[PDB]
Design a binder for this molecule. Structure first.
Ligand SMILES: [Ca+2]
Length: 260
């Protein structure tokens, strides 16, 4: 039982050519507001492996929503941000992930695709007007398929993280390797982005993006916590600079708290 796209990689299909970013099915099982910027596919669902999965497939060159030659294709869901910065404020997403395919250019720095990301605006400028904080970028690992062909068999998950608020590009972000997961393996996911009391500094706050991936913790403190105004999460599929990305999400949940 499989819900993998194996046809030719093309940039658009009729069934994926949505006219507005908010194109969704009735009563989606995945939580959050759809943001569909890929004419390759629309959000849909499968019933396999004993669960219901939101299907997020995108291909290189399929972004028909953003102005040309700007942002990568995506189909994501946005989650209401925690707009507070006191200790105890947080945004918390959970779900079950399967990775089936990710983008590949043959060069690491442009390969891989994001299945979720932490965002949050900050004071003082720097960066785009709604800048990312960190993204969870899955890179392909190849192996033989049993008939002599190299195919994607597993995925190295890296965190792409700002060096400073608003950072982007080679100087503005760093890649930290997290862990490998097999193709189609069901992975428990948690991402919590929030503010907590700084142990080393009585009155100060830390801004964190702490993930759990398949039972393992990958915690990280966001630079310049005093400039953050909020904590936000998005998930789905984003970025595909060559080829096709395929992510599957089940049993998603989201909660938040705003504490001043
Ligand atoms: Ca679409």
């Amino acid at each position: 039982q499989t819900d993998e796209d194996t046809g030719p990689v093309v940039d658009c299909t009729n069934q994926g050519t949505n006219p507005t970013r908010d194109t969704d099915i009735p009563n989606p099982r995945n939580i959050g507001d759809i943001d569909d910027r890929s004419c390759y596919a629309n959000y849909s669902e499968s019933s396999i492996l004993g669960k219901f999965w939101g299907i997020y497939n995108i291909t290189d060159g399929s972004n028909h929503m953003d102005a040309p030659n700007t942002l990568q294709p995506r189909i994501e869901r946005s989650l209401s941000r925690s707009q507070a910065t006191g200790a105890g404020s947080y945004a918390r997403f959970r779900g079950v992930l399967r990775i089936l395919e990710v983008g590949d250019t043959g060069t690491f720095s442009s390969s891989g695709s994001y299945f979720m990301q932490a965002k949050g605006k900050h004071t003082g400028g720097g960066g785009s007007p709604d800048p990312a904080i960190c993204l969870y970028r899955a890179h392909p690992v190849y192996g033989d398929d049993g008939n002599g062909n190299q195919v994607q068999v597993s995925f190295d998950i890296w965190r792409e993280q700002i060096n400073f608020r608003g950072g982007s590009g080679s100087a503005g972000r760093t890649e930290v390797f997290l862990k490998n997961v097999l193709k189609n393996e069901q992975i428990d996911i948690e991402l919590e982005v929030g503010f907590r009391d700084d142990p080393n500094n009585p009155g100060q706050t830390l801004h964190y993006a702490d993930a759990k991936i398949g039972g393992e913790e990958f915690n990280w403190n966001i630079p310049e916590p005093e400039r953050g105004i909020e904590s936000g999460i998005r998930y789905g599929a984003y970025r595909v600079k060559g080829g096709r990305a395929q992510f599957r999400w089940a049993n998603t949940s989201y909660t938040k708290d705003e504490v001043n």
